[PDB]
Amino acid sequence: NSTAELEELLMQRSLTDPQLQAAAAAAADFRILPDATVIKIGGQSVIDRGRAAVYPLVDEIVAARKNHKLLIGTGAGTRARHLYSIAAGLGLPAGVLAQLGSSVADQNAAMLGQLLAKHGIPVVGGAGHSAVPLSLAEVNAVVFSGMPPYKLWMRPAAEGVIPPYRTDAGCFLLAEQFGCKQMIFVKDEDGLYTANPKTSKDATFIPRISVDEMKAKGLHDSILEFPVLDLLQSAQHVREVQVVNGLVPGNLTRALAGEHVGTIITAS
Protein backbone atom coordinates (compact mmCIF):
# COMPACT_ATOMS: atom_id res chain seq x y z
CA ASN A 1 0.00 0.00 0.00
CA SER A 2 1.63 3.19 -1.26
CA THR A 3 1.86 6.37 0.77
CA ALA A 4 -0.81 7.76 -1.56
CA GLU A 5 -3.28 5.01 -0.65
CA LEU A 6 -2.52 5.60 3.03
CA GLU A 7 -3.12 9.36 2.78
CA GLU A 8 -6.43 8.90 0.95
CA LEU A 9 -7.60 6.50 3.66
CA LEU A 10 -6.35 8.82 6.41
CA MET A 11 -8.43 11.67 4.95
CA GLN A 12 -11.59 9.81 3.91
CA ARG A 13 -12.10 7.10 6.55
CA SER A 14 -12.54 6.87 10.29
CA LEU A 15 -9.38 5.85 12.13
CA THR A 16 -11.44 2.82 13.21
CA ASP A 17 -11.59 1.60 9.60
CA PRO A 18 -9.76 -1.76 9.33
CA GLN A 19 -8.52 -0.79 5.86
CA LEU A 20 -6.90 2.36 7.26
CA GLN A 21 -5.46 0.44 10.22
CA ALA A 22 -3.90 -2.12 7.88
CA ALA A 23 -2.37 0.55 5.63
CA ALA A 24 -0.82 2.32 8.62
CA ALA A 25 0.64 -0.99 9.82
CA ALA A 26 2.77 -1.11 6.65
CA ALA A 27 4.55 2.15 7.51
CA ALA A 28 8.29 2.25 8.08
CA ASP A 29 9.58 1.61 11.61
CA PHE A 30 11.96 4.16 13.16
CA ARG A 31 13.74 3.49 16.46
CA ILE A 32 14.41 6.72 18.35
CA LEU A 33 17.01 5.46 20.87
CA PRO A 34 18.01 2.08 19.44
CA ASP A 35 21.24 1.67 21.45
CA ALA A 36 19.84 2.53 24.89
CA THR A 37 18.79 0.12 27.63
CA VAL A 38 15.89 0.85 29.98
CA ILE A 39 16.38 -0.29 33.58
CA LYS A 40 13.69 -0.25 36.25
CA ILE A 41 14.98 -0.04 39.83
CA GLY A 42 12.32 -1.53 42.08
CA GLY A 43 10.84 0.70 44.75
CA GLN A 44 9.79 -1.87 47.32
CA SER A 45 12.37 -4.44 46.23
CA VAL A 46 15.41 -2.12 46.13
CA ILE A 47 15.16 1.56 47.03
CA ASP A 48 12.97 1.01 50.10
CA ARG A 49 15.79 -1.20 51.45
CA GLY A 50 18.18 1.72 51.81
CA ARG A 51 21.94 1.91 51.45
CA ALA A 52 22.64 -1.84 51.61
CA ALA A 53 20.74 -2.27 48.33
CA VAL A 54 21.10 1.17 46.72
CA TYR A 55 24.81 1.92 47.18
CA PRO A 56 26.03 -1.19 45.31
CA LEU A 57 23.66 -0.44 42.43
CA VAL A 58 24.92 3.15 42.24
CA ASP A 59 28.40 1.68 41.78
CA GLU A 60 27.15 -0.63 39.03
CA ILE A 61 25.38 2.23 37.22
CA VAL A 62 28.54 4.35 37.32
CA ALA A 63 30.61 1.43 36.02
CA ALA A 64 28.07 0.34 33.40
CA ARG A 65 27.54 3.75 31.79
CA LYS A 66 31.15 3.64 30.58
CA ASN A 67 29.98 1.17 27.91
CA HIS A 68 26.15 1.34 27.88
CA LYS A 69 23.56 4.06 27.39
CA LEU A 70 21.14 3.80 30.32
CA LEU A 71 17.55 5.04 30.90
CA ILE A 72 17.04 4.32 34.65
CA GLY A 73 13.47 4.42 35.95
CA THR A 74 12.45 4.18 39.60
CA GLY A 75 9.59 2.34 41.25
CA ALA A 76 7.44 3.63 44.09
CA GLY A 77 7.16 1.05 46.87
CA THR A 78 5.69 1.00 50.35
CA ARG A 79 4.77 4.69 50.60
CA ALA A 80 2.61 4.31 47.48
CA ARG A 81 0.90 1.25 48.98
CA HIS A 82 0.12 3.32 52.08
CA LEU A 83 -1.39 6.08 49.91
CA TYR A 84 -3.35 3.49 47.93
CA SER A 85 -4.73 2.04 51.17
CA ILE A 86 -5.82 5.45 52.48
CA ALA A 87 -7.42 6.51 49.20
CA ALA A 88 -9.04 3.13 48.52
CA GLY A 89 -10.62 3.21 51.99
CA LEU A 90 -12.16 6.57 51.08
CA GLY A 91 -13.71 5.21 47.88
CA LEU A 92 -11.46 7.23 45.59
CA PRO A 93 -11.12 5.94 42.01
CA ALA A 94 -8.10 4.47 40.26
CA GLY A 95 -7.36 7.74 38.48
CA VAL A 96 -6.87 9.53 41.79
CA LEU A 97 -4.67 6.76 43.21
CA ALA A 98 -2.55 6.95 40.05
CA GLN A 99 -1.68 10.59 40.75
CA LEU A 100 -0.77 9.79 44.36
CA GLY A 101 1.57 6.94 43.41
CA SER A 102 3.48 9.15 40.97
CA SER A 103 4.71 11.38 43.79
CA VAL A 104 6.39 8.40 45.48
CA ALA A 105 8.30 7.29 42.39
CA ASP A 106 9.44 10.92 42.08
CA GLN A 107 10.82 10.82 45.62
CA ASN A 108 12.83 7.71 44.79
CA ALA A 109 14.17 9.22 41.56
CA ALA A 110 15.30 12.28 43.54
CA MET A 111 17.15 10.22 46.16
CA LEU A 112 18.86 8.01 43.58
CA GLY A 113 19.68 11.05 41.45
CA GLN A 114 21.35 12.86 44.34
CA LEU A 115 23.69 9.89 44.83
CA LEU A 116 24.56 10.04 41.11
CA ALA A 117 24.83 13.82 40.63
CA LYS A 118 28.58 13.97 41.30
CA HIS A 119 29.04 11.38 38.53
CA GLY A 120 27.33 13.67 36.00
CA ILE A 121 24.07 11.71 35.77
CA PRO A 122 20.94 13.92 35.89
CA VAL A 123 17.39 13.34 37.00
CA VAL A 124 15.07 14.09 33.98
CA GLY A 125 11.27 13.90 33.41
CA GLY A 126 11.69 10.94 31.03
CA ALA A 127 13.38 9.62 27.92
CA GLY A 128 12.06 12.55 25.88
CA HIS A 129 14.99 14.77 26.92
CA SER A 130 17.77 12.19 27.31
CA ALA A 131 19.36 13.05 23.95
CA VAL A 132 22.35 15.06 25.19
CA PRO A 133 23.10 13.00 28.35
CA LEU A 134 23.09 9.76 26.29
CA SER A 135 25.52 11.22 23.74
CA LEU A 136 28.18 12.11 26.34
CA ALA A 137 30.69 9.56 27.61
CA GLU A 138 30.92 11.67 30.77
CA VAL A 139 27.23 11.09 31.55
CA ASN A 140 25.71 8.39 29.20
CA ALA A 141 22.77 7.82 31.58
CA VAL A 142 19.71 9.50 33.08
CA VAL A 143 17.35 8.82 35.98
CA PHE A 144 13.58 9.31 35.76
CA SER A 145 10.46 8.29 37.65
CA GLY A 146 8.82 5.20 36.21
CA MET A 147 5.13 6.03 36.61
CA PRO A 148 3.10 6.49 33.41
CA PRO A 149 1.47 9.90 32.82
CA TYR A 150 -2.14 8.67 32.65
CA LYS A 151 -3.04 10.28 36.01
CA LEU A 152 -6.85 10.70 36.22
CA TRP A 153 -7.17 9.08 32.76
CA MET A 154 -5.77 5.80 34.11
CA ARG A 155 -7.79 2.87 32.84
CA PRO A 156 -9.03 1.01 35.95
CA ALA A 157 -8.66 -2.70 36.48
CA ALA A 158 -11.66 -4.98 36.06
CA GLU A 159 -11.86 -5.21 39.88
CA GLY A 160 -10.70 -2.73 42.55
CA VAL A 161 -9.20 0.75 42.41
CA ILE A 162 -5.44 -0.09 42.43
CA PRO A 163 -4.03 1.45 39.21
CA PRO A 164 -3.16 -1.51 36.87
CA TYR A 165 -0.44 0.41 34.93
CA ARG A 166 2.30 1.32 37.48
CA THR A 167 6.14 1.65 37.21
CA ASP A 168 6.78 -1.69 35.48
CA ALA A 169 4.39 -0.69 32.69
CA GLY A 170 5.67 2.88 32.58
CA CYS A 171 9.27 1.78 32.10
CA PHE A 172 8.37 -0.91 29.58
CA LEU A 173 6.31 1.43 27.41
CA LEU A 174 9.22 3.89 27.41
CA ALA A 175 11.56 1.17 26.15
CA GLU A 176 8.98 0.19 23.52
CA GLN A 177 8.12 3.62 22.17
CA PHE A 178 11.77 4.75 21.95
CA GLY A 179 12.77 1.47 20.29
CA CYS A 180 15.40 0.64 22.90
CA LYS A 181 17.41 -2.56 22.57
CA GLN A 182 16.86 -4.02 26.04
CA MET A 183 14.54 -3.84 29.07
CA ILE A 184 15.82 -5.00 32.47
CA PHE A 185 13.68 -5.12 35.62
CA VAL A 186 15.75 -4.99 38.82
CA LYS A 187 13.95 -6.69 41.71
CA ASP A 188 14.84 -8.55 44.93
CA GLU A 189 14.57 -12.13 43.63
CA ASP A 190 16.79 -14.07 41.25
CA GLY A 191 13.94 -14.21 38.73
CA LEU A 192 10.67 -15.98 38.05
CA TYR A 193 9.83 -19.12 40.03
CA THR A 194 6.99 -21.61 39.83
CA ALA A 195 5.62 -19.90 42.96
CA ASN A 196 6.28 -16.82 45.06
CA PRO A 197 9.68 -17.72 46.58
CA LYS A 198 9.02 -15.56 49.65
CA THR A 199 5.83 -17.44 50.60
CA SER A 200 6.58 -20.91 49.22
CA LYS A 201 9.14 -23.47 50.36
CA ASP A 202 9.95 -25.40 47.18
CA ALA A 203 9.43 -23.04 44.24
CA THR A 204 11.47 -23.85 41.13
CA PHE A 205 13.50 -21.29 39.20
CA ILE A 206 12.47 -20.51 35.61
CA PRO A 207 15.34 -19.20 33.42
CA ARG A 208 13.25 -18.56 30.29
CA ILE A 209 9.53 -18.53 29.54
CA SER A 210 7.01 -17.00 27.14
CA VAL A 211 4.01 -14.89 28.12
CA ASP A 212 1.67 -17.66 26.97
CA GLU A 213 3.56 -20.22 29.05
CA MET A 214 3.36 -17.94 32.09
CA LYS A 215 -0.42 -17.58 31.77
CA ALA A 216 -0.86 -21.34 31.34
CA LYS A 217 1.11 -21.88 34.58
CA GLY A 218 -0.98 -19.37 36.54
CA LEU A 219 1.86 -16.82 36.69
CA HIS A 220 0.14 -13.95 34.87
CA ASP A 221 0.51 -11.69 37.95
CA SER A 222 3.68 -12.73 39.78
CA ILE A 223 7.00 -10.86 39.51
CA LEU A 224 5.69 -8.28 37.01
CA GLU A 225 2.53 -6.20 36.75
CA PHE A 226 0.40 -8.56 34.70
CA PRO A 227 -0.63 -5.79 32.26
CA VAL A 228 3.05 -5.67 31.25
CA LEU A 229 2.89 -9.20 29.85
CA ASP A 230 -0.01 -8.16 27.60
CA LEU A 231 1.81 -5.00 26.52
CA LEU A 232 4.87 -7.16 25.80
CA GLN A 233 2.87 -9.35 23.41
CA SER A 234 1.71 -6.23 21.53
CA ALA A 235 5.14 -4.58 21.40
CA GLN A 236 6.78 -3.69 18.09
CA HIS A 237 10.34 -3.12 19.35
CA VAL A 238 10.90 -4.78 22.75
CA ARG A 239 9.85 -8.41 22.35
CA GLU A 240 11.49 -9.77 25.51
CA VAL A 241 12.46 -8.55 28.97
CA GLN A 242 14.93 -9.67 31.62
CA VAL A 243 14.26 -9.77 35.37
CA VAL A 244 17.31 -9.80 37.65
CA ASN A 245 18.14 -9.53 41.35
CA GLY A 246 19.50 -6.10 42.24
CA LEU A 247 20.64 -7.39 45.64
CA VAL A 248 23.24 -9.71 44.07
CA PRO A 249 26.45 -7.68 43.51
CA GLY A 250 27.23 -7.17 39.83
CA ASN A 251 23.98 -8.70 38.56
CA LEU A 252 23.05 -5.56 36.61
CA THR A 253 26.56 -5.24 35.17
CA ARG A 254 26.49 -8.88 34.05
CA ALA A 255 23.02 -8.54 32.52
CA LEU A 256 24.22 -5.54 30.50
CA ALA A 257 27.20 -7.62 29.34
CA GLY A 258 24.83 -10.19 27.83
CA GLU A 259 24.98 -12.78 30.62
CA HIS A 260 21.72 -14.66 31.12
CA VAL A 261 21.31 -14.01 34.83
CA GLY A 262 17.74 -14.07 36.07
CA THR A 263 14.72 -14.79 33.89
CA ILE A 264 14.10 -13.85 30.25
CA ILE A 265 10.40 -13.42 29.45
CA THR A 266 9.58 -13.49 25.73
CA ALA A 267 6.48 -12.17 23.99
CA SER A 268 6.17 -15.39 21.96
Binding site: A24, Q99, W153
Partner: protein, 246 residues
Protein backbone atom coordinates in the same frame (compact mmCIF):
# COMPACT_ATOMS: atom_id res chain seq x y z
CA UNK B 1 -17.33 -3.40 48.94
CA UNK B 2 -18.82 -0.80 46.60
CA UNK B 3 -17.94 1.41 43.66
CA UNK B 4 -15.80 4.52 44.22
CA UNK B 5 -17.49 7.78 45.18
CA UNK B 6 -18.59 10.32 42.57
CA UNK B 7 -16.20 13.28 42.65
CA UNK B 8 -18.34 15.69 40.58
CA UNK B 9 -21.81 14.09 40.42
CA UNK B 10 -23.44 17.28 39.09
CA UNK B 11 -21.11 17.56 36.08
CA UNK B 12 -22.19 17.13 32.46
CA UNK B 13 -19.43 16.29 29.97
CA UNK B 14 -19.82 17.11 26.27
CA UNK B 15 -17.33 15.88 23.67
CA UNK B 16 -17.25 17.86 20.41
CA UNK B 17 -15.91 15.94 17.43
CA UNK B 18 -12.88 17.39 15.70
CA UNK B 19 -14.54 16.84 12.32
CA UNK B 20 -17.42 19.02 13.51
CA UNK B 21 -14.96 21.82 14.24
CA UNK B 22 -13.31 21.19 10.85
CA UNK B 23 -16.50 22.44 9.16
CA UNK B 24 -15.71 25.99 10.26
CA UNK B 25 -18.11 28.80 11.06
CA UNK B 26 -21.05 27.09 9.33
CA UNK B 27 -21.08 24.41 12.04
CA UNK B 28 -19.32 26.20 14.92
CA UNK B 29 -21.50 29.31 15.12
CA UNK B 30 -24.80 27.39 15.56
CA UNK B 31 -23.07 25.11 18.08
CA UNK B 32 -21.68 28.11 19.98
CA UNK B 33 -25.15 29.65 20.16
CA UNK B 34 -26.64 26.42 21.50
CA UNK B 35 -23.84 26.12 24.07
CA UNK B 36 -24.45 29.73 25.14
CA UNK B 37 -28.08 28.90 25.93
CA UNK B 38 -27.04 25.76 27.85
CA UNK B 39 -24.68 27.56 30.26
CA UNK B 40 -27.47 28.58 32.71
CA UNK B 41 -28.93 25.05 32.58
CA UNK B 42 -25.90 22.80 33.19
CA UNK B 43 -22.41 22.66 34.67
CA UNK B 44 -20.46 21.79 31.52
CA UNK B 45 -17.04 20.35 30.81
CA UNK B 46 -16.69 20.74 27.03
CA UNK B 47 -13.97 18.58 25.46
CA UNK B 48 -12.81 18.86 21.84
CA UNK B 49 -11.49 16.18 19.51
CA UNK B 50 -8.77 16.46 16.89
CA UNK B 51 -10.24 16.08 13.40
CA UNK B 52 -8.56 16.20 10.02
CA UNK B 53 -5.34 17.99 11.03
CA UNK B 54 -4.42 14.94 13.12
CA UNK B 55 -4.82 12.83 9.97
CA UNK B 56 -2.27 15.03 8.21
CA UNK B 57 0.27 14.84 11.04
CA UNK B 58 -0.27 11.07 11.06
CA UNK B 59 0.47 11.08 7.33
CA UNK B 60 3.76 12.92 7.85
CA UNK B 61 4.68 11.06 11.03
CA UNK B 62 4.04 7.62 9.53
CA UNK B 63 6.00 8.59 6.42
CA UNK B 64 8.90 9.43 8.76
CA UNK B 65 8.41 6.03 10.42
CA UNK B 66 7.55 7.42 13.84
CA UNK B 67 6.01 5.03 16.40
CA UNK B 68 2.53 5.28 17.85
CA UNK B 69 3.78 6.93 21.04
CA UNK B 70 5.15 9.77 18.93
CA UNK B 71 1.90 10.23 16.98
CA UNK B 72 -0.31 10.40 20.09
CA UNK B 73 0.89 13.79 21.42
CA UNK B 74 0.95 15.20 17.88
CA UNK B 75 -2.76 14.43 17.44
CA UNK B 76 -3.54 15.66 20.95
CA UNK B 77 -2.15 19.08 19.98
CA UNK B 78 -4.88 19.42 17.33
CA UNK B 79 -7.63 18.64 19.84
CA UNK B 80 -6.20 21.36 22.06
CA UNK B 81 -6.22 23.92 19.25
CA UNK B 82 -9.88 23.11 18.58
CA UNK B 83 -10.54 23.73 22.27
CA UNK B 84 -8.82 27.11 22.12
CA UNK B 85 -10.95 28.08 19.12
CA UNK B 86 -14.19 27.04 20.82
CA UNK B 87 -13.29 28.75 24.10
CA UNK B 88 -12.44 31.98 22.28
CA UNK B 89 -15.95 32.06 20.80
CA UNK B 90 -17.40 31.70 24.33
CA UNK B 91 -14.97 34.05 26.11
CA UNK B 92 -17.55 36.82 26.46
CA UNK B 93 -19.66 34.36 28.49
CA UNK B 94 -16.81 33.71 30.94
CA UNK B 95 -15.59 30.49 29.31
CA UNK B 96 -11.88 29.70 28.95
CA UNK B 97 -9.75 26.77 27.84
CA UNK B 98 -8.07 24.82 30.65
CA UNK B 99 -5.19 22.36 30.44
CA UNK B 100 -5.06 18.70 31.42
CA UNK B 101 -3.44 19.19 34.88
CA UNK B 102 -5.99 21.90 35.68
CA UNK B 103 -8.79 19.59 34.50
CA UNK B 104 -7.35 16.76 36.59
CA UNK B 105 -6.82 18.66 39.86
CA UNK B 106 -8.74 21.98 39.87
CA UNK B 107 -11.94 21.38 37.75
CA UNK B 108 -14.08 21.93 40.92
CA UNK B 109 -12.79 25.48 41.61
CA UNK B 110 -12.99 26.44 37.93
CA UNK B 111 -16.63 25.35 37.64
CA UNK B 112 -17.28 27.32 40.83
CA UNK B 113 -15.79 30.36 39.07
CA UNK B 114 -17.70 30.03 35.78
CA UNK B 115 -20.47 27.96 34.23
CA UNK B 116 -18.36 26.02 31.72
CA UNK B 117 -14.76 25.32 30.76
CA UNK B 118 -13.25 23.87 27.60
CA UNK B 119 -10.45 21.32 27.51
CA UNK B 120 -8.90 18.69 25.28
CA UNK B 121 -10.67 15.33 25.01
CA UNK B 122 -7.41 13.55 24.15
CA UNK B 123 -5.94 11.76 27.19
CA UNK B 124 -2.30 12.16 28.28
CA UNK B 125 -1.03 8.78 27.13
CA UNK B 126 1.39 10.34 24.60
CA UNK B 127 4.74 8.48 24.50
CA UNK B 128 3.24 5.91 26.89
CA UNK B 129 0.51 4.98 24.41
CA UNK B 130 -0.09 1.26 24.06
CA UNK B 131 1.61 -0.53 21.15
CA UNK B 132 -0.09 -2.71 18.57
CA UNK B 133 -1.63 -0.29 16.10
CA UNK B 134 0.37 2.43 14.39
CA UNK B 135 -2.67 4.71 14.97
CA UNK B 136 -2.77 6.05 18.60
CA UNK B 137 -5.99 3.78 20.33
CA UNK B 138 -6.81 6.20 23.25
CA UNK B 139 -8.30 9.16 21.24
CA UNK B 140 -10.88 11.95 22.08
CA UNK B 141 -13.91 9.67 22.69
CA UNK B 142 -11.85 7.43 24.98
CA UNK B 143 -10.30 10.29 26.95
CA UNK B 144 -13.64 12.05 27.41
CA UNK B 145 -15.20 8.87 28.80
CA UNK B 146 -12.28 8.05 31.11
CA UNK B 147 -12.59 11.56 32.55
CA UNK B 148 -16.38 11.56 32.82
CA UNK B 149 -16.47 8.15 34.52
CA UNK B 150 -13.56 8.95 36.84
CA UNK B 151 -15.47 12.06 37.98
CA UNK B 152 -18.74 10.15 38.34
CA UNK B 153 -20.33 12.79 36.12
CA UNK B 154 -24.06 12.84 35.43
CA UNK B 155 -23.45 12.03 31.76
CA UNK B 156 -21.28 12.11 28.67
CA UNK B 157 -22.71 13.22 25.33
CA UNK B 158 -20.72 12.81 22.10
CA UNK B 159 -21.42 15.39 19.39
CA UNK B 160 -20.83 13.97 15.91
CA UNK B 161 -21.24 15.03 12.28
CA UNK B 162 -23.69 12.13 11.73
CA UNK B 163 -26.97 11.10 13.35
CA UNK B 164 -25.27 8.31 15.33
CA UNK B 165 -23.92 4.81 14.76
CA UNK B 166 -24.95 2.91 11.63
CA UNK B 167 -24.30 -0.66 10.55
CA UNK B 168 -21.85 0.75 7.99
CA UNK B 169 -20.12 4.04 7.26
CA UNK B 170 -22.99 6.34 6.15
CA UNK B 171 -20.51 8.33 4.02
CA UNK B 172 -18.37 5.41 2.86
CA UNK B 173 -18.34 2.82 0.07
CA UNK B 174 -21.02 0.57 1.60
CA UNK B 175 -23.12 3.62 2.57
CA UNK B 176 -26.10 2.06 0.78
CA UNK B 177 -26.28 -0.80 3.29
CA UNK B 178 -25.97 1.43 6.37
CA UNK B 179 -28.86 1.08 8.83
CA UNK B 180 -29.23 3.48 11.75
CA UNK B 181 -28.85 2.02 15.25
CA UNK B 182 -30.99 3.92 17.79
CA UNK B 183 -29.68 1.85 20.68
CA UNK B 184 -26.78 -0.56 21.23
CA UNK B 185 -24.48 -2.00 23.87
CA UNK B 186 -20.73 -1.46 24.01
CA UNK B 187 -20.25 -5.24 24.13
CA UNK B 188 -22.29 -5.75 20.95
CA UNK B 189 -20.30 -3.04 19.15
CA UNK B 190 -17.00 -4.48 20.38
CA UNK B 191 -17.82 -7.90 18.91
CA UNK B 192 -18.50 -6.26 15.53
CA UNK B 193 -15.87 -5.60 12.88
CA UNK B 194 -15.92 -2.53 10.69
CA UNK B 195 -15.66 1.22 11.18
CA UNK B 196 -17.43 3.21 13.88
CA UNK B 197 -17.76 6.94 14.61
CA UNK B 198 -16.24 6.34 18.07
CA UNK B 199 -12.89 4.91 19.16
CA UNK B 200 -12.79 1.15 19.56
CA UNK B 201 -10.95 1.82 22.83
CA UNK B 202 -14.08 3.60 24.06
CA UNK B 203 -15.85 0.23 24.08
CA UNK B 204 -13.02 -1.24 26.16
CA UNK B 205 -13.09 1.44 28.86
CA UNK B 206 -16.89 1.19 28.96
CA UNK B 207 -16.50 -2.44 30.03
CA UNK B 208 -14.57 -1.38 33.15
CA UNK B 209 -16.70 1.72 33.82
CA UNK B 210 -17.90 2.36 37.37
CA UNK B 211 -20.60 5.04 36.99
CA UNK B 212 -21.64 6.10 33.48
CA UNK B 213 -24.47 3.82 32.32
CA UNK B 214 -25.16 5.30 28.87
CA UNK B 215 -23.53 7.59 26.32
CA UNK B 216 -25.53 9.20 23.51
CA UNK B 217 -24.01 10.06 20.13
CA UNK B 218 -25.92 12.93 18.51
CA UNK B 219 -25.63 15.07 15.38
CA UNK B 220 -24.13 18.44 16.29
CA UNK B 221 -25.07 19.71 12.83
CA UNK B 222 -28.76 19.61 13.83
CA UNK B 223 -29.46 22.49 16.25
CA UNK B 224 -31.27 21.36 19.38
CA UNK B 225 -30.10 17.75 19.58
CA UNK B 226 -27.31 18.50 22.07
CA UNK B 227 -29.83 20.39 24.21
CA UNK B 228 -32.24 17.45 24.03
CA UNK B 229 -29.53 14.87 24.75
CA UNK B 230 -28.46 16.75 27.89
CA UNK B 231 -32.06 16.35 29.10
CA UNK B 232 -32.01 12.60 28.43
CA UNK B 233 -34.10 12.76 25.25
CA UNK B 234 -33.36 10.09 22.64
CA UNK B 235 -32.27 11.93 19.48
CA UNK B 236 -29.24 9.86 18.50
CA UNK B 237 -27.58 6.53 19.24
CA UNK B 238 -27.60 5.38 22.86
CA UNK B 239 -24.62 3.23 23.90
CA UNK B 240 -25.17 1.12 27.01
CA UNK B 241 -21.88 0.72 28.88
CA UNK B 242 -22.75 -2.30 31.03
CA UNK B 243 -22.70 -0.39 34.31
CA UNK B 244 -25.77 -1.53 36.24
CA UNK B 245 -27.95 1.03 38.08
CA UNK B 246 -29.12 0.81 41.68
Amino acid sequence: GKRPIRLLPWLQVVKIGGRVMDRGADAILPLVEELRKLLPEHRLLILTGAGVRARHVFSVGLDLGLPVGSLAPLAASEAGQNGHILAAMLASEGVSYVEHPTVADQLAIHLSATRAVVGSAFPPYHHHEFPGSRIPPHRADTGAFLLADAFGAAGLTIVENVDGIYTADPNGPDRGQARFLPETSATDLAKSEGPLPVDRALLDVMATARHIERVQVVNGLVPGRLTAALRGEHVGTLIRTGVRPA
